[PDB]
Amino acid sequence: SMSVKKPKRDDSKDLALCSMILTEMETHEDAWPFLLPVNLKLVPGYKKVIKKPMDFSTIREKLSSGQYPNLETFALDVRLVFDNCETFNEDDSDIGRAGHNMRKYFEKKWTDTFK
Template identity: 35%
Template sequence: MCTFCVLRASQSWRYPKQMTYQEALTCQISDHQLECQYLLLCLYHADEEHIAVADPCINVRNYTSVIKSPIWLDRVVEKLQQNLYQSVQHFVSDVLLIFTNCATFNRDNAEFRVMGERLKDLFEREFKSTFSIQLQHPTASNSQ
C-alpha cells in the first residue's frame, strides 16, 4: 500500500489523543514525516491543474517581481526529504506560503485564486484530521 492509503487507513488509531493546533505545530518533523508526506500527497492529488507543483519562477512571467519568497510543492518535498524542516510549523509555514503567494500573484485572476483557496482549505482540513486537532471553542482565539 502507498503512504496515502496507509495513513488514511490508520488515522483513527494513530492519534487517539486529540491535540491543539499549537501542539501539532511544535512537534518535531522527524516524528511526523509520514503525516507531512500524506498531506503533500493530498495536495498533489487535488491540484489537477498543477498550479502549485513546479517552480513558478521558470514559466510564469513577472512572478519574481510580485512574489519575493517563491515556494512550490516540489520544493517543499525536496526540503522534507533533505531534513531541512525542524518542526511541523516550518513545514506548514512553507505550504501556507504557497497559498499566500498564489492569492497575491493571482489577485486579478479569480480562477487561479479560487483554485489556490480550495487547495488551502483542503490542506487545513486534512492537517486537522491527520493530527487529530481538537475543535476549539468558538470564543477561543483564532491563532491558527
C-alpha cells in the same frame, strides 16, 4: 524553562504524516498551479513581486532532505504557496479559486491529523 517541561508529545510519526498530507495535496485535481516552481523567466512580475517563491515540488525536496526542523515550519511553507497565490492572482480566476480550494483542503487535513 530550565528543568521545567510539558509532557513529551510523540513526534516520531510527524515526518511520515506530513509526507502523506503532501501526497494528498499533490494528487488533488486543483494542484496543477502549485506542482512546480513558477517560471521566473517566463512570468513577468513574479520574481520582483513574490519575494519567497514556494511550490509543492520544493516542499517535497525540503521534506525528503531534513530541511524542516518541525511540523510548524512545514505548515508555514504550505501556507506560503497559497499566500503567494493570493498575492499574484485575482480571486475570480481559475488559479485564484484553486488556491482557495487547496488551502481549505490542507487546513482540514492539518487539523484532522494533528489537532
